[PDB]
Amino acid sequence: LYIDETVNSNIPTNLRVLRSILENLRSKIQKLESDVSAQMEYCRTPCTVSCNIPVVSGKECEEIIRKGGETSEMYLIQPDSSVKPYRVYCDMNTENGGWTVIQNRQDGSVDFGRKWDPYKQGFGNVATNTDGKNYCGLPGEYWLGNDKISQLTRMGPTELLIEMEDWKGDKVKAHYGGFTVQNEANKYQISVNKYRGTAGNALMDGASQLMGENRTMTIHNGMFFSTYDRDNDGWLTSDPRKQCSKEDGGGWWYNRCHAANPNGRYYWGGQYTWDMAKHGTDDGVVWMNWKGSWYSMRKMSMKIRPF
Amino acid sequence: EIMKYEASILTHDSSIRYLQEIYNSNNQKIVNLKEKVAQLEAQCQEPCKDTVQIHDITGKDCQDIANKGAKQSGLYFIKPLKANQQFLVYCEIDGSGNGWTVFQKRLDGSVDFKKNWIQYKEGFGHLSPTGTTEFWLGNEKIHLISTQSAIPYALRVELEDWNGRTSTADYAMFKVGPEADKYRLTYAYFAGGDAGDAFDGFDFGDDPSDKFFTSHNGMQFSTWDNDNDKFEGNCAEQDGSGWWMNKCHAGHLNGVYYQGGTYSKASTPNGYDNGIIWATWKTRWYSMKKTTMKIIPFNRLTIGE
Amino acid sequence: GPRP
């Protein structure tokens, strides 16, 4: 009957926003369309550095702290001399030093969402000029190649140290006295143990705040490193658009899918939510057992050692 | 009646019509704004470009390599006839065809040469592709690269100052004793160079012996914490340093890198000389500004070819 | 996060 007013009132609160916000969002399809031109531009010119390689070297960062390497920066460790002396970043300040970094999160800079080769060889900046010295005392995000890693673990007793620091200062440290990244022939299986840690055993002890069948499919230990061109996940599905790596952003020992996700997608401020991610999933530098699926961090590193 | 005029408030048949496009455009729009990223990130894939870079050709010493090609005075991994982990050295190739190698250098003050034995051994400080960069290849290294079948090497003390001129002091049959006999040098004779020869003692008058001691030839290496000198103790530590000591020295290239050089009786920690002096050029207060000490296989002082 |  009288429903004929929605023609002069209810509607007058419709095209008044379907125009509005479709405009005040039209001005987004603007900014967020030039800033891409304005950084794509200041991308025409690559960045550079000068890590004057210091004298002191060694087999790995341990022997190098056992050779006077007391400052933390870009060193040149050379494992079995049946290989090439690859630049690396040593930690010789926290925990008796000798900590050879493998991965490092502290800001954007490096797209960790790569493939096979890159994850195997390595990518990123192993270090940057300390802004006022010759060498490179400040670390930059990278993934010291897998192959390089699977070899370092292969030096008998390899013990990785996984640290993180959440945006509000606070920080915790994980740890697996026993760590071993098989060789690429094994799809790079990850064997970890001797877990100790105040950050939650998210690699083997699966994701805590959950339950059985849902949890254990958040165990990385015994997993086959994967990347969006190498489906070695735990997620069995004929559907190729759905794989633990194509989602969750990056390469990781994926087991349907993760209780921890360093190497995810870099999230600023930490907190983030599905309605933000490329695939809704909880992709990003997340360590679930300490912060849960919806909290990426500031810095997420991984330093190993022998013994 | 006229109410059938509602066909008027039937404007939305375009109050929505047009606007609608401003929707179907954005979506379609973003199809484009996809590649306008697919491409940007495909650029942000490589890391920063680094200056320092390792040439391939290698061999015995800098000379050997740079006789199998070579010409760019830079950085190569050498591996002494008898050695293990081929380390990294800062060669300095010339035109004639000889490749020197360095064990020292000084310019800024950066790499503080007041380290410890294990450091002065395996070598410390940081090299560089150019050369500009204080560094001490380290006594150990200096060994396997001077006693490799022992084809007579040499030292070429070079210099300069806060006034222009530079120099050069040579020595033949160069060698550094294995850590065993300690890191005591063993040469035969000074061989020219207006640089001077303070490795042959220098009498400061304080006492006739103001020269018997201050000889550096044959004097083992005295780090601050492990001296093998000829003092009532560790000279080095006294003026702080790790340099082939005696009671004490005359010519310091591993010491206090003084600004504007020339120091006094004030910057003397404990009280005596430590600066970058060298009596067969300048006194015991003038601290050199630059400094380097490179070696090379003897049969090069009159190479001819 | 696991998968359903």
Place this chain on the structure above:
Amino acid sequence: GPRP
């Protein structure tokens, strides 16, 4: 230099 020289010493005592």
Place this chain on the structure above:
Amino acid sequence: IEVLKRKVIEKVQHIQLLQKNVRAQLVDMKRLEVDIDIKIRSCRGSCSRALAREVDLKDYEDQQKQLEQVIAKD
């Protein structure tokens, strides 16, 4: 001389369409904005100078809220 509110409804419904569609737009950007924000960053370690900006989600996650009210008309 039948009036015709039929065409009316068919239009007001023709709106409900671009309310499903909008919510999509509004969110398509709530994630596209951030594919870039994250990829603009992923350059610092490859490309020279970078851009330092913001986003303000209290805009999107607000310009959303008022839209979730615009519903119910039959």
